[PDB]
Amino acid sequence: LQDAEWYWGDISREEVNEKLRDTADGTFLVRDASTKMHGDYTLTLRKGGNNKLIKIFHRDGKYGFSDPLTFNSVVELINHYRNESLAQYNPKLDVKLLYPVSKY
Numbered sequence: 001l002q003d004a005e006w007y008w009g010d011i012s013r014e015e016v017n018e019k020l021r022d023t024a025d026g027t028f029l030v031r032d033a034s035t036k037m038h039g040d041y042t043l044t045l046r047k048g049g050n051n052k053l054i055k056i057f058h059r060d061g062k063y064g065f066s067d068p069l070t071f072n073s074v075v076e077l078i079n080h081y082r083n084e085s086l087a088q089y090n091p092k093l094d095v096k097l098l099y100p101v102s103k104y
């Protein structure tokens with residue numbers, strides 16, 4: 001993850017939104033969070049109307065989204081999903097984010 005694609009490199013609602021203005025009904029990129037001001041970003045996706053905010057559970061450089069913070073790369077994860085879909089971490093409903101945004 002030297003730069004990833006979906007992620008522009010930690011930005012702000014200004015850039016994120018600006019692009020998610022209304023393009024695609026299910027976009028997804030990264031959002032600069034806080035906490036000691038370091039890592040741990042925030043996943044944000046355009047639900048086709050409102051930007052849904054999601055937090056990233058990080059600890060010492062790894063990530064927390066599926067495995068018990070045992071893995072370490074988001075690309076590896078997000079990749080496994082890009083080909084599939086994220087059932088919103090819960091059944092009954094589900095959505096797919098195959099419409100990332102960037103400048104590549």
